[PDB]
Amino acid sequence: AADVVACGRHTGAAVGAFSRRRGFVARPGQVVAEPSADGRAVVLNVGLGPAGSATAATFRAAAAASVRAVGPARTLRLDLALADGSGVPAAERARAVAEGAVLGLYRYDEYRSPLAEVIVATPERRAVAEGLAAAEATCLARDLVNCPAGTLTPPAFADRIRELAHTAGLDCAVYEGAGLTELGLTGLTAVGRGSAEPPRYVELTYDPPDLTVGLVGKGVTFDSGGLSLKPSGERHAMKADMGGAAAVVAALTALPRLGLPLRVRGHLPLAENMPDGGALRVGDVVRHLDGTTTEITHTDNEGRVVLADVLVRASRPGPHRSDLVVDVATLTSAAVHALGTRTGALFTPDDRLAQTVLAASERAGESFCRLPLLAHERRNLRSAVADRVNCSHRHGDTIQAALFLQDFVAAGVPWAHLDIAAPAYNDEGPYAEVPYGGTGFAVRTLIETLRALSE
Amino acid sequence: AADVVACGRHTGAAVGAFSRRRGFVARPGQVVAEPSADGRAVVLNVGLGPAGSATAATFRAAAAASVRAVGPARTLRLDLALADGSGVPAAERARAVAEGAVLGLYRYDEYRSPLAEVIVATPERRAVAEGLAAAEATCLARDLVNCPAGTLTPPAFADRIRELAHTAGLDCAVYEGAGLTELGLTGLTAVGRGSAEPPRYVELTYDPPDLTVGLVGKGVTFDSGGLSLKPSGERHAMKADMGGAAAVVAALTALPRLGLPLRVRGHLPLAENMPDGGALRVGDVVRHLDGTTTEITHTDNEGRVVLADVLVRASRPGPHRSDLVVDVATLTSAAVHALGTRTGALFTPDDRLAQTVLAASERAGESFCRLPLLAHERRNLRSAVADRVNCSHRHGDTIQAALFLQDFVAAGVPWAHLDIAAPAYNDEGPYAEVPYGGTGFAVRTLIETLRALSE
Amino acid sequence: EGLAAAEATCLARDLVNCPAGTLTPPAFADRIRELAHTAGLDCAVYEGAGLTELGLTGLTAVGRGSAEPPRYVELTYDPPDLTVGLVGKGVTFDSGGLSLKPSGERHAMKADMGGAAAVVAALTALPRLGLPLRVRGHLPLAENMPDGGALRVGDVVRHLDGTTTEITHTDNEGRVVLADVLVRASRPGPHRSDLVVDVATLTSAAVHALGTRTGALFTPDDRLAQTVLAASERAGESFCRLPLLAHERRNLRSAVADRVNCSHRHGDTIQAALFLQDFVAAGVPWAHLDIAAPAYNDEGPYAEVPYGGTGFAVRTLIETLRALSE
Ligand SMILES: [Mn+2]
Ligand SMILES: [Mn+2]
Ligand SMILES: [Mn+2]
Ligand SMILES: [Mn+2]
Numbered sequence A, B: 001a002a003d004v005v006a007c008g009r010h011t012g013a014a015v016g017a018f019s020r021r022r023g024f025v026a027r028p029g030q031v032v033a034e035p036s037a038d039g040r041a042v043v044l045n046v047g048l049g050p051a052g053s054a055t056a057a058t059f060r061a062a063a064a065a066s067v068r069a070v071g072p073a074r075t076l077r078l079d080l081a082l083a084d085g086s087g088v089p090a091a092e093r094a095r096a097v098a099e100g101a102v103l104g105l106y107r108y109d110e111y112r113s114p115l116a117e118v119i120v121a122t123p124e125r126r127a128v129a130e131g132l133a134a135a136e137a138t139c140l141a142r143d144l145v146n147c148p149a150g151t152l153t154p155p156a157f158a159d160r161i162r163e164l165a166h167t168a169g170l171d172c173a174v175y176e177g178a179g180l181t182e183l184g185l186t187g188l189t190a191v192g193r194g195s196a197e198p199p200r201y202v203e204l205t206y207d208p209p210d211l212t213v214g215l216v217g218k219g220v221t222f223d224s225g226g227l228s229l230k231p232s233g234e235r236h237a238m239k240a241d242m243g244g245a246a247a248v249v250a251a252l253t254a255l256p257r258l259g260l261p262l263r264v265r266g267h268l269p270l271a272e273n274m275p276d277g278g279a280l281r282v283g284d285v286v287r288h289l290d291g292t293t294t295e296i297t298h299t300d301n302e303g304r305v306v307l308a309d310v311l312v313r314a315s316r317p318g319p320h321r322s323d324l325v326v327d328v329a330t331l332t333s334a335a336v337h338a339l340g341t342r343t344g345a346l347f348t349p350d351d352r353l354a355q356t357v358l359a360a361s362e363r364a365g366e367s368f369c370r371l372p373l374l375a376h377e378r379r380n381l382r383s384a385v386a387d388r389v390n391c392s393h394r395h396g397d398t399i400q401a402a403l404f405l406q407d408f409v410a411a412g413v414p415w416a417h418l419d420i421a422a423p424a425y426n427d428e429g430p431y432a433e434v435p436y437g438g439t440g441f442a443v444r445t446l447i448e449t450l451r452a453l454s455e
Numbered sequence C: 001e002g003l004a005a006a007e008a009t010c011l012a013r014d015l016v017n018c019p020a021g022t023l024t025p026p027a028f029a030d031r032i033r034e035l036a037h038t039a040g041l042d043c044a045v046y047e048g049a050g051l052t053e054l055g056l057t058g059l060t061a062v063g064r065g066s067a068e069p070p071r072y073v074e075l076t077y078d079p080p081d082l083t084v085g086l087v088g089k090g091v092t093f094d095s096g097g098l099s100l101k102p103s104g105e106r107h108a109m110k111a112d113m114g115g116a117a118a119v120v121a122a123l124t125a126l127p128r129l130g131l132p133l134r135v136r137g138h139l140p141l142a143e144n145m146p147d148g149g150a151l152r153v154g155d156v157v158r159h160l161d162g163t164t165t166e167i168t169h170t171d172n173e174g175r176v177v178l179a180d181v182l183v184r185a186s187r188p189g190p191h192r193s194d195l196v197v198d199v200a201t202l203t204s205a206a207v208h209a210l211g212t213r214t215g216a217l218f219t220p221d222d223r224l225a226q227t228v229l230a231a232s233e234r235a236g237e238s239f240c241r242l243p244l245l246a247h248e249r250r251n252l253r254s255a256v257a258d259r260v261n262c263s264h265r266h267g268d269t270i271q272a273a274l275f276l277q278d279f280v281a282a283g284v285p286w287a288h289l290d291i292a293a294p295a296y297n298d299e300g301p302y303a304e305v306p307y308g309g310t311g312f313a314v315r316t317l318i319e320t321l322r323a324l325s326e
């Protein structure tokens, strides 16, 4: 039995006397190992819960639990997708089992000083291939987020995107120094100025021969806070503030494999936010690409300032025309207080786009909830000096940040904003298919959203 | 095989192909379950590490890991103590396996809305019986510490000690109200006054027909801080501030089973420290039983004030004469900063008593380190008003608290002080034989110390 | 002998009291060079590219944020008459780095080179005493400053022994700086350092338990412990031994590297000692002296101790080296 075989069991399914004696009750993610019938290999009995309540997430989580229980085995065959009786069709089971296996195997050992084959048993080969690709993209995002900021600097991150673009056949332009200055991304330049690592701006285009979607990803490779320095003695995953950029890049790398008939452009501002003799100051004013002005009332609300000019560039009327814009950003720390650590916030004025993103997230097994663009919170954007502030010092910053970003989206362009600060990094232990640390959150939601949009 | 049999394996010992295929490498506490040879029951292979490095703690921890992996089995036989090859003699193996099994099975489910038999296989029946008794005493302390303070009030705790004394044949006197006032325990009375639950004082004596040892246990059943109220938003196990009293009571309950030829008296001041219109005030002075005075500079350093008069009573020259005094107290929060969460502090001027307690702790597998009674820290006891303060507001409070207690021990009486604030409560997850929450720390050290003293 | 021991102590007092803007790492290296020359001690100063070649990546990473570049100095007392290695933490100014020390709390940030001061001063006294033993001083010198190019939380240092440390708090910089020096000092090689003692104003957690006038001693070697403690008694300096608790190693674990420089949990004094232990070559006896609190007296003068820099550990070291030479 190829070293280890993992069998999915719904509640009520038969297992041997040994599994029963060990307490196997088919609880989701429960794994009991036993010798195979011939005594030459290992069987894992893996719980899928009641058949009537099982979802694709159940299969995804059960696959992750299987690969975690593999021990020193060289080969693992997952039969989980062959369990029927639930409402989850075979193709969705196969896709989810494939995702969960890759996501569950993920390790980040690059900075530390025998499993050779995972096989998914199913006729749904296409679904398996899609699952593997989606999960591999997620793991790419995980690597990028986990990467120490001293390795993944803005220049190094730009180089990495260039290499990934080259592999995938994606068109890539990297802007730096004077070339960057010409673009008028004054938020990026101002925020990035304090650091010894100069900022970068990268555009990625997936453009198959077969609507144009713009993806904007916040790539603050290290967020210290700037002069409004993050308190020492509080823990912050400061290197993880490029999770939005990671999600966008990774999603873009998966599109050529899927062959989606839609044009997608990625827009990635990359910078460090550092304290320094030449750092952006509280009370300074940024004049943005659209001529409007932002007073910097708190240097740690840097992401919205960096994204502003990119949203103008991405959405402005011009050559070939981006029909809709989605931004992804580890933007706000206020959200998590209400929503908790595992749910992202979705903002959009477009109800059908909201539905498209939420349904995409459900298929992907990623938790989002929509928050309203409350008109009465615009009063908290007011500045005594400029057109707006980047920080009100009042409650409601998650909503205020969304309204701030909305100011820079050209009139009539459908737009959605994904604030993923909390779910982008897991500071608790591993659970299900999610490791400690960088999660790659939103990659799969984005892929699913782009699929629906292409249909 | 009696549902489940647990086999101890040192590194290099033979296991079946299944255990090897699962990755069993005899790592301490590693458990791999497999069917028995006849297919009718369960075998647990349990790691004991290399034979040359195994200690009694290894066996204790391996036993705890065994009982945790039992599943729904009705009977468990531990063969762990029959593994030889290590330096741990058979009797010590049996004692430790017995302790670990009971300690590992411990659960505290009283306030929540199939295992019927654990058997230890060995000829060392006496050692097993001693291990079970020591562990049962530890679990009694665990229950007392875990108990909600609203259930274990000072009056209710006094009643519980009375019941335990009655079972064991121990002489017990409970003092309350006017009877308590007569004893002159003015620290206890002053600290306890703010609460609606009145304080208690309990004396327990083990007095077999076969030296007199005095045990003093801090029994603050709930420490809010008093008027110097503990900051809300910081977590404190305020109900666990009676861990010292718990350890002393539990140790006393084990002595009749062991039949130690020594007289041991327990002295237990019990109170709540609460804010109230009538609570002890910052700047108030307590006149103690020896006529000396303490200025209350911080109401949250209440334990030393409560213990002071009890130490005078316990050590004063008088009827039958207590030859040595050991106090146990969850006293200080400063210690943990240096020593960490799993090590108690030991203070004594007596080098041979220090050695006796430390060696006892080693046998028991409880971590202590001796701290010095630094003469230059007495300057931090000075008060502008009284003979001493209960808080210097300077670094070194763990040492200062010990010196404070030393003031009340009658001249020439050997004395040791055990500060166990951190190890008395585990606020991390369970590990080895230690659960989350109340640990019963110091019970086994005390029993081992009294054994050595009786020899 | 008393005058010489006290004069060495006063040299350490001067070095600690010196404003950090005067006693920069380059200036401190120059001062050691001058003191070595007086005493007849062999001295090598490493800087820039020459420093880079040594692979002291902890020192370089910690020191990078400052405008004052780091230095590394080796001092050898080598009379014609065992080889003892002394490692001294020389952070000439510890601001905290990006994990910046809170403003409104008082810290003697210039005093974070007290360990280096004690080692240098002890070495200057040896030629006067004529002790028959070879003693090498190893002094990493740097400023820990916030800057656009400062070491970041989450960065990984790859040390001279190939092992890795994740920087979870930039204010636990001393252990990171000392790591590579301990590898260099203890590695098997030419003439062979038989034992290593490090002295460092390392930890702020200790003082909570021990108070302001007592240093912490760590060593797995019971006889070396006794030698140092008895030396301290003769010198009138207060130390207490703390255990190298095996169960505190779990708090060194990192999700990314081989270890962290900060657990954000209780027990950092012990954890820091275990961290340093990782870099001492197998079989080399080692002791660690954590003297953050007693190195600087922030209360008024008492007895023979002034306000400010105390020169703590100089006399203990001299007494320890005397006993070791006998
Ligand atoms: Mn920020
Ligand atoms: Mn940010
Ligand atoms: Mn208290
Ligand atoms: Mn208390």
Ligand SMILES: [Mn+2]
Pocket: C094, C096, C170, C171, C172, C173, C174
């Ligand atoms: Mn520091």
Ligand SMILES: [Mn+2]
Pocket: C091, C094, C112, C171, C173, C174, C201, C202
């Ligand atoms: Mn330092």
